[PDB]
Design a protein around this ligand. Structure first.
Ligand SMILES: [Zn+2]
Length: 246
């Protein structure tokens, strides 16, 4: 064949694709795929949203120093941190992370999207985050998925210097957030932008439709979405390697 490598890798991805076990559920077997595609649509909508938000300097007033946000590391893990610095030219943010990468009891990264103002969904998929010694990490603005309303007053500068007075308030606030968390995302997009509102409306529609499903009420959806997710990734990779879809 004129394409040995392509064939090899394709065969591999196919095998790995069909070697996936799907656990049965009387609450997901009906509408879980739609939940998946709609979820990915939500994620994409958020990405584009952040892409359009970083354009207007108003974003600095949204991600002011000490802004609690939920981003994702290269491994698609959800982390909570504070906004320390923002760069418009590079579209990157210096976030101080106080939480380890959220992972299932299995060990694999959680692929579920965190929906603000969703007590049930939270309690079912995101029971609690584990605290970790804070460390500065740069992350692209596009990675941010949730922008909470809560903000850390004390300057992070003193926290970096490890001043006891600052570390007390930092630890207290952090433990406050982790003990009981009812994150609520509120963004004042009315300030500027036109496409922003459209993206917001569309995303809210996607959410209204996704919460209408039955898999959304599932207790163990966080573990049931894994196989479908992996199968999705592998599938897309296969279609690509096949030079298919033009
Ligand atoms: Zn289920």
């Amino acid at each position: 064949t004129l394409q040995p490598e392509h064939e090899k890798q394709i065969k591999v991805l196919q095998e790995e694709l069909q070697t996936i076990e799907y656990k049965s559920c009387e609450i997901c077997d009906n509408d879980i795929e739609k939940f998946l595609e709609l979820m990915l649509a939500y994620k994409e909508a958020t990405v584009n949203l952040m892409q359009e938000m970083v354009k207007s300097p108003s974003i600095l007033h949204i991600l002011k120093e000490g802004r609690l946000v939920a981003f994702r590391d290269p491994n698609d893990c959800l982390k909570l941190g504070f906004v320390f610095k923002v760069s418009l030219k590079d579209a990157v943010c210096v976030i101080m992370t106080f939480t380890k990468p959220y992972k299932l009891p299995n060990g694999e990264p959680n692929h579920l999207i965190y929906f603000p103002k969703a007590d049930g969904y939270r309690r079912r998929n995101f029971p609690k985050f584990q605290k970790t010694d804070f460390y500065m990490e740069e992350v692209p603005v596009t990675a941010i998925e949730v922008i909470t309303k809560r903000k850390f007053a004390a300057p992070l500068g003193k926290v970096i210097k490890k001043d006891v007075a600052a570390l007390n308030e930092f630890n207290a606030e952090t433990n406050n957030i982790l003990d009981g968390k009812t994150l609520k995302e509120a963004i004042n997009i009315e300030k500027q932008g036109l496409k922003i509102h459209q993206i917001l409306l569309d995303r809210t529609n996607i959410r209204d439709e996704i919460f209408k499903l039955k898999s959304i009420k599932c207790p163990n959806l966080s573990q049931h979405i894994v196989p479908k997710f992996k199968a999705h990734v592998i599938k897309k990779k296969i279609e690509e390697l096949y030079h298919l879809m033009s």
